PDB file of C-alpha atoms in Angstrom:
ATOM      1  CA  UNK J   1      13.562  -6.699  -1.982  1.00  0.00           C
ATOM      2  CA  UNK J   2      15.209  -3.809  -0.925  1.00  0.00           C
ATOM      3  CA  UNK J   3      18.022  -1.864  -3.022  1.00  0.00           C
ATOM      4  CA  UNK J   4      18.578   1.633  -4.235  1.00  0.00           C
ATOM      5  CA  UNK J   5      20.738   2.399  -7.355  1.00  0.00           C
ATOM      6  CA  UNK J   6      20.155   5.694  -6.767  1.00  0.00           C
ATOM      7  CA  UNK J   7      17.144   6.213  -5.209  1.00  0.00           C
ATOM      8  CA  UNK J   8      17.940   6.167  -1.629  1.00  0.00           C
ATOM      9  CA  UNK J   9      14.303   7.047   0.452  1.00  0.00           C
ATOM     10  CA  UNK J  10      13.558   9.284  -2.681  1.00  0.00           C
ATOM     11  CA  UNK J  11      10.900   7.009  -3.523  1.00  0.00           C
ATOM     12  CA  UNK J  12       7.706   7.519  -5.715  1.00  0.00           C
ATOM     13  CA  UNK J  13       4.339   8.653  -4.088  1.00  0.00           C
ATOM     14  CA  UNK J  14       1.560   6.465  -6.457  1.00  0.00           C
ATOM     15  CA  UNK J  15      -2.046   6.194  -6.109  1.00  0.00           C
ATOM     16  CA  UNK J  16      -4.553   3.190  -5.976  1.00  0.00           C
ATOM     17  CA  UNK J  17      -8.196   3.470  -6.278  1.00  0.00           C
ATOM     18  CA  UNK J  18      -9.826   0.469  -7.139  1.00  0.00           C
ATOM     19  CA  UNK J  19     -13.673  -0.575  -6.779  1.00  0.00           C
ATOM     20  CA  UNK J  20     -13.613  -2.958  -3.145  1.00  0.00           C
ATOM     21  CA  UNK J  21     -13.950  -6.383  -4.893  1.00  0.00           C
ATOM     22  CA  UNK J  22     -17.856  -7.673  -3.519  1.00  0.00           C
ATOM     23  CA  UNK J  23     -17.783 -11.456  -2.163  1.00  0.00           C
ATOM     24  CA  UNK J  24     -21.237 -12.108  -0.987  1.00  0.00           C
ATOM     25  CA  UNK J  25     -21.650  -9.432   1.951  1.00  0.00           C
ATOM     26  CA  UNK J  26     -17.865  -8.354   1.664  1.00  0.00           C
ATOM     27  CA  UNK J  27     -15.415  -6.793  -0.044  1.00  0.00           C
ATOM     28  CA  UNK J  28     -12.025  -8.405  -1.340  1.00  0.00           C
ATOM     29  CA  UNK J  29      -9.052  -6.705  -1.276  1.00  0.00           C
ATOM     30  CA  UNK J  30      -6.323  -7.487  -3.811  1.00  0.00           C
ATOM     31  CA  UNK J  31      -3.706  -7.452  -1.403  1.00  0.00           C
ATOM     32  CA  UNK J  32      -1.791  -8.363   1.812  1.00  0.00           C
ATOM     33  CA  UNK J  33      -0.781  -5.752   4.176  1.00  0.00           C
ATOM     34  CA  UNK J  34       0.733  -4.255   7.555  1.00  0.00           C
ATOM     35  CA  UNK J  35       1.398  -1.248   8.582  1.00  0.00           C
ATOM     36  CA  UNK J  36       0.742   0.317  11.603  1.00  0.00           C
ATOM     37  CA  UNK J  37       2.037   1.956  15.053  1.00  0.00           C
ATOM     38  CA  UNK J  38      -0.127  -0.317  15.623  1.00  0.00           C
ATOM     39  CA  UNK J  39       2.152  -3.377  14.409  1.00  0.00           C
ATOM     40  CA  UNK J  40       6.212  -3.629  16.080  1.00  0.00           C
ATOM     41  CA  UNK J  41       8.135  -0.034  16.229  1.00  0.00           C
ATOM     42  CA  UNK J  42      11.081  -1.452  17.577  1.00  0.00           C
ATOM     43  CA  UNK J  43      12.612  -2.455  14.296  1.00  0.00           C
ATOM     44  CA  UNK J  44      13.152   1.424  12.891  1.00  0.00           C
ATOM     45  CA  UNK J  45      13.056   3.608  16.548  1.00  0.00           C
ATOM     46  CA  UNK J  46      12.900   6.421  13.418  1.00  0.00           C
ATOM     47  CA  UNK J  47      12.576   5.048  10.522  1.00  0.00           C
ATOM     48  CA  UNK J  48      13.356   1.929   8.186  1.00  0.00           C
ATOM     49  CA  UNK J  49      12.577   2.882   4.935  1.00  0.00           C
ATOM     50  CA  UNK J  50       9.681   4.843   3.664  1.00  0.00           C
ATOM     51  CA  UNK J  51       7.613   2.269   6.162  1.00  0.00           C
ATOM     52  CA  UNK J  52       8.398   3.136   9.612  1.00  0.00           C
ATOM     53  CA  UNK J  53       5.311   3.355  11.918  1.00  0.00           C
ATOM     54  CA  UNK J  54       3.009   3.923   8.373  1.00  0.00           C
ATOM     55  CA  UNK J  55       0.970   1.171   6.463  1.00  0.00           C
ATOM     56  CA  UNK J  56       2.788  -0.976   3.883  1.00  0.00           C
ATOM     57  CA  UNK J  57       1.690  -4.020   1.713  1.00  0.00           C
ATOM     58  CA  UNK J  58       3.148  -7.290   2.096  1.00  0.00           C
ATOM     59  CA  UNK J  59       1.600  -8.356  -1.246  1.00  0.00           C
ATOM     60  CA  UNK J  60      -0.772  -7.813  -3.966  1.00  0.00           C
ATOM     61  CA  UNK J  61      -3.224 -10.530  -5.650  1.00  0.00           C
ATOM     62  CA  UNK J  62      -2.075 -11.444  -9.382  1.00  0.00           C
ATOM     63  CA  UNK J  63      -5.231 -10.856 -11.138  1.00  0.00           C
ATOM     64  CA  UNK J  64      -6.419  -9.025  -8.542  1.00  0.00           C
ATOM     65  CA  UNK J  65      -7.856  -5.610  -8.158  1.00  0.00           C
ATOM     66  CA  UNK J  66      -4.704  -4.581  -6.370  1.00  0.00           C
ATOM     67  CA  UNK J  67      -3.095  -4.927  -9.345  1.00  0.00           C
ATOM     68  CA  UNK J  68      -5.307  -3.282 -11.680  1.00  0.00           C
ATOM     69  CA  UNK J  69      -4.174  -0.008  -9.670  1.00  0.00           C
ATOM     70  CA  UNK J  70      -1.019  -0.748  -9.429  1.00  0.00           C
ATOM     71  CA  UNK J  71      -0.241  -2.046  -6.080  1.00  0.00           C
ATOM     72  CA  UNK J  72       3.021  -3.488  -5.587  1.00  0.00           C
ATOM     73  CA  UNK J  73       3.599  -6.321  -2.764  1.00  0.00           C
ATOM     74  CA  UNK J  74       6.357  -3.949  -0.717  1.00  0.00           C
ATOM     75  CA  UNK J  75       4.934  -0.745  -0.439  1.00  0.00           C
ATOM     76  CA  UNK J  76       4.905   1.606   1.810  1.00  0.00           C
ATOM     77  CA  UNK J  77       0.957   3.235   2.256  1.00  0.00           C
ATOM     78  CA  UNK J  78       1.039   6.578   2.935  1.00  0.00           C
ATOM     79  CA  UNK J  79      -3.054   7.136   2.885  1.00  0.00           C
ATOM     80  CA  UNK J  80      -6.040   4.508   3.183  1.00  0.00           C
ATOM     81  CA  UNK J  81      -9.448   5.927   1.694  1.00  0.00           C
ATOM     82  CA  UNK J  82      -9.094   9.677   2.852  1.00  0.00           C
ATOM     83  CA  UNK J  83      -6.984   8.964   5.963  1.00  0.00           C
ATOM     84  CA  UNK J  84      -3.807   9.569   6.665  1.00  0.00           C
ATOM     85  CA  UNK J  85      -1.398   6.865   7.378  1.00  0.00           C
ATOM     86  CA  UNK J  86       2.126   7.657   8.496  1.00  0.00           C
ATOM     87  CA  UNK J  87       1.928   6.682  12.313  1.00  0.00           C
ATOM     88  CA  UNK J  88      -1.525   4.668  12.199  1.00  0.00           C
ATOM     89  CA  UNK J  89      -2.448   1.465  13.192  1.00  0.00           C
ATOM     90  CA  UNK J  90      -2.608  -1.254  11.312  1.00  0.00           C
ATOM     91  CA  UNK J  91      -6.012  -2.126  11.982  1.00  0.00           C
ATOM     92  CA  UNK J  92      -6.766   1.329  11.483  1.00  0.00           C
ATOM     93  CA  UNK J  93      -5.842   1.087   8.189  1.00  0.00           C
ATOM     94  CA  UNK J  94      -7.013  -2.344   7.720  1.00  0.00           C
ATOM     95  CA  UNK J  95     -10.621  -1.356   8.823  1.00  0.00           C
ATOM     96  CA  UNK J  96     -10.724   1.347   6.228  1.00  0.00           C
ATOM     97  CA  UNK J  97      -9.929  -0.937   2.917  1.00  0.00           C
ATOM     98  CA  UNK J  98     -12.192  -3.566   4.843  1.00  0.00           C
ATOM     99  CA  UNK J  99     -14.989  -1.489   4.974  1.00  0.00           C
ATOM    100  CA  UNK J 100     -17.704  -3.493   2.805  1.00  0.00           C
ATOM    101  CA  UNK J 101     -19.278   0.245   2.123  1.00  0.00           C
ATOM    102  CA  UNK J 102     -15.950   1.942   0.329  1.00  0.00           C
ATOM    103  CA  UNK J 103     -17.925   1.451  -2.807  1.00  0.00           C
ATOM    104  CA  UNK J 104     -14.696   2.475  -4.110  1.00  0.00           C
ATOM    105  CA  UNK J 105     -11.446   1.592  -2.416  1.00  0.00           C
ATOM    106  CA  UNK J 106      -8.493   4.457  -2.002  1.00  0.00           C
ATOM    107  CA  UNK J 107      -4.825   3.857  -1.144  1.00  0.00           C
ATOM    108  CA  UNK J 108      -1.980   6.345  -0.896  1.00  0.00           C
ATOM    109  CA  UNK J 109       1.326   4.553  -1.919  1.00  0.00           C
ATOM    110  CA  UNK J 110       4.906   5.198  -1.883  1.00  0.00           C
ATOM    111  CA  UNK J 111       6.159   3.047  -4.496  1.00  0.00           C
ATOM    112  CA  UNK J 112      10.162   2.508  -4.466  1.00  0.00           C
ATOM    113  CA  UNK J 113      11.539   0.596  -7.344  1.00  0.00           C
ATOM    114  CA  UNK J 114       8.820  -2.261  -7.940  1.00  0.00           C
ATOM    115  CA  UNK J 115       9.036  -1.527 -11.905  1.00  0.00           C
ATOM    116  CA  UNK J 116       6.587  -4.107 -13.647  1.00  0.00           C
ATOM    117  CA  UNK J 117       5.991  -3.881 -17.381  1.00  0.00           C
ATOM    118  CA  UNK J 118       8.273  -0.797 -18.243  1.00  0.00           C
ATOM    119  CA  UNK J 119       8.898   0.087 -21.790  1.00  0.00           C
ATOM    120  CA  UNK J 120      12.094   0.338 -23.196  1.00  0.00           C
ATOM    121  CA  UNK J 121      12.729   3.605 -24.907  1.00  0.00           C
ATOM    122  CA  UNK J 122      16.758   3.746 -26.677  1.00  0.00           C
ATOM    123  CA  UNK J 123      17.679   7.513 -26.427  1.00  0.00           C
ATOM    124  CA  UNK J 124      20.873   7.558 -28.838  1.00  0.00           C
TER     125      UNK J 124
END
């Protein structure tokens, strides 16, 4: 899950918006996540990747709306829905996307090396 050919914390700051996903009287989101000062700081006293005391995603839904934006199982959120999450907790976070009102759901990600459907492109 973790390796850098050259790429070392110089990661790549993407963006997910996707419309919350409406069950019934909630909203789904398309992935599993933690991130938070909230969660357990004593594994990176400074940092242990582009996570450290910010929100990351432990997964994404295949099919679903996580996806569709282009979230990536392993990545390190560095915004939920206007906020700013670098040293939040994870509930914080977590109450934001789970808001059943975000008509419309916003997620700032830092995006490392989870390359899905790239396109091959010989240079000779």
């Amino acid at each position: 899950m973790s390796y850098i050919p050259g790429q070392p914390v110089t990661a790549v700051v993407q963006r997910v918006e996707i419309h919350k996903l409406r069950q019934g009287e909630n909203l789904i989101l398309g992935f599993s996540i933690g991130g938070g000062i909230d969660q357990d700081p004593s594994q990176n006293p400074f940092s242990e990747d582009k996570t450290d005391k910010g929100i990351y995603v432990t997964r994404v839904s295949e099919g679903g709306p996580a996806e569709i934006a282009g979230l990536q199982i392993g990545d390190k959120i560095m915004q939920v829905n206007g906020w700013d999450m670098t040293m939040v907790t994870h509930d914080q976070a977590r109450k934001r996307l789970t808001k059943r009102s975000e008509e419309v759901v916003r997620l700032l990600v830092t995006r490392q090396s989870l390359q899905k459907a790239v396109q091959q492109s010989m240079l000779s």
